[PDB]
Design a protein around this ligand. Structure first.
Ligand SMILES: O=C(CNS(=O)(=O)c1ccc(-c2ccccc2)cc1)NO
Ligand SMILES: [Ca+2]
Ligand SMILES: [Ca+2]
Ligand SMILES: [Ca+2]
Ligand SMILES: [Zn+2]
Ligand SMILES: [Zn+2]
Length: 158
């Protein structure tokens, strides 16, 4: 599949969920990017205006792509693989309740998974992998990619 063909990648937060403090959204997303820059040559920078490679959006129901959200539960988020335009973008279902902790749906953990897709990863069959497509809270303060995730991303970058 597609990959980014450059090392400096930008992201922009289109809008903020009212579920969380603004600074906590910023930090969760920053930390999620750091998970992947830790194990690749990629460098991520937040921009506040203009066209970013990865646009982060909170939206509910039908929201202008061909892929609608479904209210609370079920689909939590989705993201597009590397490419122009909508490529790379990561969308989070506002009908979920996003948090910094084990309550609701943890934004950081979900963003790690989605950014994996934004960088070109698909799903893993390994339940230990962050790319395993079932959300499960794990302690975010000690979170680590599985060997499978590191294998996956290092097949695309580095
Ligand atoms: O795969 C999907 C669509 N399905 S999902 O949104 O139910 C979903 C979303 C995120 C996750 C997830 C997996 C591991 C950690 C955090 C979230 C699981 C299911 N989007 O990427
Ligand atoms: Ca949903
Ligand atoms: Ca994009
Ligand atoms: Ca919400
Ligand atoms: Zn979408
Ligand atoms: Zn997924």
């Amino acid at each position: 599949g597609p990959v980014w063909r450059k090392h400096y990648i930008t992201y922009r937060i289109n809008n903020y969920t009212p579920d969380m403090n603004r600074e906590d959204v910023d930090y969760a997303i920053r930390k999620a990017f750091q998970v992947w820059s830790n194990v690749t040559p990629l460098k991520f920078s937040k921009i506040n205006t203009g066209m970013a490679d990865i646009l982060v959006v909170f939206a509910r129901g039908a929201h202008g792509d061909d892929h609608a959200f479904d209210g609370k539960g079920g689909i939590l988020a989705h993201a597009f693989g590397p490419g122009s335009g909508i490529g790379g973008d990561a969308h989070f279902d506002e009908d979920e309740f996003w948090t910094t902790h084990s309550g609701g749906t943890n934004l950081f953990l979900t963003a790690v998974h989605e950014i994996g897709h934004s960088l070109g990863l698909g799903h893993s069959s390994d339940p230990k992998a962050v790319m395993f497509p079932t959300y499960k809270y794990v302690d975010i303060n000690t979170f680590r990619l599985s060997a499978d995730d590191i294998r996956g991303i290092q097949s695309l970058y580095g």
